[PDB]
Amino acid sequence: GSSGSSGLEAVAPERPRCAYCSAEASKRCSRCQNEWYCCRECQVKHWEKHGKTCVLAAQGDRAKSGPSSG
């Protein structure tokens, strides 16, 4: 009996959040698209810092999706 393999750790992903109020982000920076925020209110506030991180980045790889309505 010569065996020994183990590495199937299961972990669930976490939803995005704001950077100022860590509140429901469900939004993306309309400048770099590499940040999350609840509303423009915070975006402006935490802009002095984020700014540096924000770098002109055009849209790249897009995912597939399709919402619905009731």
Q: Which residues are annotated as a binding site?
A: 18, 21, 29, 32, 38, 42, 50, 54
Q: Which is nearer to Zn ion, 16 or 54 (CB)?
A: 54
32 binds Zn ion per the rule CB under 5 A: yes
Report the C-alpha gap between 31 and 51 in whole angstroms. 10
Task: Print the binding letters for residues 2-31 with Zn ion: x by CB under 5 A, - otherwise.
Answer: ----------------x-xx-x-----x-x
Report the C-alpha gap between 36 and 15 in whole angstroms. 10
List contacts with Zn ion (CB under 5 A). 18, 20-21, 23, 29, 31-32, 38, 42, 54
